[PDB]
């Protein structure tokens, strides 16, 4: 079977991360048998040498001499750590020279909840893991690439990454869909300047049979944590929309009403006289839907999802003791049933099963052997292949660049508002957006959140009629934006209308260097990880803060370009406007699933091409009306189908 | 090099049609190297015996036994022709049997004309040649396929075919563009219906290296052929510009204004004081950026341009007697130079190799090699997958779901125009369209035109109090749009807004049949090609008249799906959208390259999952006011950028 690889490959220096087992594993194992010497990076040095005797006994059997000058290993190699990428270049470059293929493979799962329950430690340490690193490596490589002519970048994302001009929503998996997409994102925006030395691409492979959604006997895969997940955030969620619910129509404190959860007995709640009809409720379908053997029919909660409970009430404004669950009583394992995980588990690989269109799951020596084959085609770049898939799920179409006004009715609603508008950089934007609030829809009051007193000064002077008439507020959020929402919250009421703008302008650098040059000028590893923190994180903490605050509307904003903005800086506006758009897409699914009724969409500034862009200051002012337009059209309330249609949804000014 | 191909599709029949040279030529002489059996089809039956000796030779070579057994050809095969397709089917099953690749490669120019310019009857053939033989191959060999449990459908489409949620206009080949869209349109929604036994998947290339581009010394090819035509396109379009704005400040007759033509002398034309200025300006021109070798660059046209000419004035409502260039003087060779042809094919492609992120096109051996490794990978279906590629070429996204209502000075340019509304089926869209038009915009009149008598009832009973006031007329147009368009013209006056929806719904029949049926009920050969007569022909012919009717905005309407639709309905309807985006946008940049302004945008009243459609009454009529605001969003004329952003665009209702 082996007979077709041979000599397909043969001198090509290939690296590859998570290179020990997985997807990784075989196309290190398939790159041997086609003749490339490769260098396998993982954490484990044990799978790493299990896997590495594994090729040199193969290459052994195939024919291949001195096998062990043919597969070497990097071990204790963390892709989330920039010195470990920084020693796993220079650890590849001594045993073989320059890189041909660098196969960016290594992908962890991340976080595995919503973002109301998501740190924004972990999300950055997933960003770092599978984003950032594929950027790290190409950085230190593609200068010995472009000089001896020839390289390739790939770029393993996900059917979950989306595609050029649709995001695919993955709920619970916010972190990783977002990492998935920006690494197709570089795929497609860098190749213009990679190109003609190096190839870039990204392969999007949709479910795989392996380990990472199987699991070993030992350690649950993929399936059974999402099981496990299904069950203990429908019980979290469950909790959070009662307490909710029940805090609107009760004039009792969230630590009263949290009170009543702390004896953790299902049936005495259920019984309680004195207890809000919600939690009466609730607690009678926790007895009537759950397994009598599971301890979750019998008690509320644990103390892992009571600690996910109390951040997100915290999060959501609630006064409640760090220590209101210290002495909640223990509930007996199991807390769910190994028949409803499975029963769970097995409802998760019959919707998968069901959704390809093959009705069937690729191995992971076929998604290896698509990608090995797929590697031999020279003239290629910029693309996602799909080694695998072809799915019904739901996909939500990016671009639209026709729209207009939102409806009189919808307008009226913004009368009385409290608008909250979140930037710095784009002064002329904020501007116009608050005096467009404040003097066209008659809001109330607008709560400018900037970065820094610099932008606070600038924002008070262009505002200073609004300022003087106790219409706009100035916050300094520095890089505490959480808590200066809280500040806005308390001191001016909760949101209606929230606009979140970059703080930070777009870096103009250059994106590759030239063929002799040092590269040194050149878009940096840390310039790029600062670029996803000012570009993405900034959004993703501002809707993780705001999705709890009950009645606001949220405009993602991503960067803006103009005829005047270097071809760099258009690149980089796209790989955000796509990277963001895999966000947006599945916080707005997440929403749904929440008992706060909260609206998020993105409003894109950025264009593809510097033709669309607008050449003289009558096109644009125009495009500055189409923005007020955009961020109207998805701020305005939807007074008492449509709600699918106004959200998780991108425009393009 | 062979080696890694010996036993990669060994005991698999591949069908490949224009497998006598080109791409075709090398899947099949691949196929054939990797162990495949093959039937070769196309039209020469030299060219098809000079292509099979070369394969039997070659398989000779590499040790195959029994060559002859391995490649037959299939001559006198033209794919445009239903018979002959038939004819293939019988002698490839009779050879092979069952056929597990079928291998849609023969792919003709077609017209290579602007819409305006397309006879209906080219635009017919190159959908019979490049589309509708892939259904009909499909249809005939799927059954078998479905009864031995495996199959492929290979489409060969093009970059130009555009992607899945953006269209890629491709002027002066709108047929071409629109035969290469259904291509992946067909892969994309017959996948689900089609596993899990079949494989159906789209192969987009970029440019390709070869006779199709380069062209032998007898014959011009692609390059050589479009410079040739860039050039007679310019004259053709120059000429036509001035004398549409000749006639606008000229009291003589179109007829008048063309007698100064017939001399056919630039230098006369120029110092003629009794000629308009833009005729004079336009012989000044032609001397002046002409080539003095040239006769282009002393007469005005030939007898080929002058045809054209007359076509586009008659076609535009214009007098003129079919015999007014009769005696027109013909030019003597080159009417353009070789030296000016060169320049032209240098030009284009340069700018081709411009836009490559590789800077290099592959080779036809390339582009197959790239195939017949991805035709081994069985884990994927309704893909495209692009084997070369990556340029940066400007695309549309689709599916904006997200509007509004267009501005108040727009909507005040509606009062007093003329509409003409298309249609038949869609009677309650109709209706409300032609009373928001009349009621709410204060329209003149709405002109009516439907396909039949019992449809022009149907309206005028609908419509009853519009009809006695003398403000909604009805015109019966059958097969013959064009002339109805005419009388429309002829007696109310040229319109404004013109909406263009389906007079047919789409068919409710199977698309794929049981295992073990006969596949009698699936939707035939003859109704895969009256699907695309009514919905996309229908398109092509409304906009083909209404392109030179100036003044007018033209809204291309797409079927209506429903939450009781079939599931085929939506799977067709997904088709039809995703076909007609590749024309929409196509006719939107030919129409800036005329004199006529004319807006051409495209409404979709289909989407893609049953999820998204409404469910209640309240939610459907949410539905039908969406669809009257997308209307009159690309419908209302822009008051004296703007033109790029309301052109070749499609929405979601
Ligand atoms: N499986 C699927 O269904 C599927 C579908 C689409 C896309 N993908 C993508 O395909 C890629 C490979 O996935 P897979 O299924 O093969 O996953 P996997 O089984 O989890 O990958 C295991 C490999 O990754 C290494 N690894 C894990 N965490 C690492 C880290 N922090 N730093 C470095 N190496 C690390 C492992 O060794 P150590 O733990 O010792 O480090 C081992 O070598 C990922 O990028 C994933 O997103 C997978
Ligand atoms: N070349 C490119 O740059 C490029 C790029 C993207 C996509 N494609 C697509 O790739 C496919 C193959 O293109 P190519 O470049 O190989 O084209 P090509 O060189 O024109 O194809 C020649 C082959 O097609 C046959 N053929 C032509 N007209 C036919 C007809 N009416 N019926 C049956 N066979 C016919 C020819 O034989 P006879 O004339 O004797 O019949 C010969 O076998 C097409 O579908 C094309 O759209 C090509």
């Known amino acids: ?108 799962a991340g976080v595995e909840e919503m973002v109301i329950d998501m740190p924004v430690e972990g999300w950055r340490h997933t960003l770092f893991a599978n984003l950032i690193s594929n950027y790290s490596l190409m950085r230190k490589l593609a200068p010995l690439m472009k000089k001896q002519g020839s390289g390739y970048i790939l770029n393993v994302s996900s059917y979950f990454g989306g595609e050029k001009d649709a995001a695919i929503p993955y709920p619970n998996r916010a972190d990783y869909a977002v990492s998935k997409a920006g690494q197709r994102a570089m795929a497609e925006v860098f190749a213009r300047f990679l190109g003609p030395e ?67 007995d299902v049936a005495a709640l259920e019984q309680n006289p004195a207890a809000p ?33 109390l951040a997100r009430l915290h999060n959501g404004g609630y006064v409640l003791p760090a220590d209101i669950f210290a002495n909640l009583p223990n509930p007996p394992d199991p807390f769910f049933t190994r028949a409803q995980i499975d029963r769970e588990a097995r409802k998760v690989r019959d919707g998968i099963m069901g959704m390809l269109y093959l009705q069937r799951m690729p191995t992971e020596f076929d998604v290896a052997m698509a990608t090995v084959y797929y590697l031999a085609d020279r003239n290629v770049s910029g693309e996602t292949f799909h080694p695998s898939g072809g799915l019904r799920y739901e996909r939500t179409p990016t671009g639209g660049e026709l729209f207009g006004l939102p409806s009189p009715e919808r307008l009226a609603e913004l009368v009385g508002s409290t608008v909250y508008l979140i930037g710095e950089h784009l002064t002329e934007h904020l501007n116009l957006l608050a005096r467009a609030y404040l003097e066209r829809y008659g809001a109330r009051q607008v709560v400018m959140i900037v970065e820094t007193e610099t932008g606070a000064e600038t924002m008070r002077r262009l505002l200073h009629d609004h300022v003087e008439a106790g219409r706009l507020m100035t916050i300094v959020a520095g890089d505490q934006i959480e808590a200066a929402i809280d500040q806005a919250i308390t001191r001016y009421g909760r949101p209606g209308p929230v606009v979140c703008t970059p703080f930070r302008p777009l870096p103009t650098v250059p994106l590759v260097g030239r063929k002799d040059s040092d590269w040194s000028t050149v878009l940096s590893e840390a310039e790029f990880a600062e670029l996803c923190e000012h570009q993405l994180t900034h959004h993703f903490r501002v809707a993780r803060k705001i999705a709890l605050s009950d009645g606001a509307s949220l405009a993602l904003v991503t960067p803006e370009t103009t005829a005047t903005s270097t071809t760099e800086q258009f690149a980089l506006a796209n790989f955000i406007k796509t990277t963001l758009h895999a966000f947006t897409a599945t916080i707005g699914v997440e929403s749904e699933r929440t008992a706060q009724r909260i609206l998020i969409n993105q409003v894109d500034l950025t264009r593809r091409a510097r033709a669309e862009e607008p050449r003289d200051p009558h096109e644009r002012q125009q495009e500055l009306e189409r923005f007020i337009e955009a961020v109207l059209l998805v701020t305005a309330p939807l007074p008492p189908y449509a709600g699918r249609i106004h959200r998780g949804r991108a425009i393009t000014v």
Chains 1, 2 share one sequence.
């Open 277 to 309: 009809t919600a939690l009466r409720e609730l607690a009678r379908r926790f007895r009537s839907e759950g397994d009598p053997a599971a301890s979750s029919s019998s008690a509320l909660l644990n103390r892992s999802i009571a600690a996910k409970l």
């Open 1 to 108: 079977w082996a007979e077709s690889l041979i000599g397909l490959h043969l001198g090509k220096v290939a690296l590859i991360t998570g290179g020990s087992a997985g997807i990784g594993g075989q196309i290190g194992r398939l790159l041997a048998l086609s003749g490339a010497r490769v260098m396998l990076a993982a954490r484990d040095r044990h799978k790493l040498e299990q896997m590495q005797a594994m090729i040199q006994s193969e290459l052994a059997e195939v024919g291949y001499t001195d096998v062990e000058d043919r597969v070497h290993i990097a071990p204790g190699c963390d892709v989330s750590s920039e010195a470990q990428l920084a020693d796993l270049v220079e650890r590849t470059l001594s045993a073989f020279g320059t890189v041909d293929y660098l196969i960016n493979n290594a992908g962890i």
């Open 198 to 264: 190096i190839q870039i691409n990204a392969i999007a492979p949709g479910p795989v049979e392996g380990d990472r959604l199987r699991g070993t006997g030992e350690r649950p895969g993929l399936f059974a944590r999402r099981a496990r997940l299904i069950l203990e955030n429908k019980r979290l969620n469950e909790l959070h929309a009662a307490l909710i619910a029940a805090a609107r129509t009760d004039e009792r404190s969230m630590h009263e009403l949290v009170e009543l959860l702390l004896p953790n």
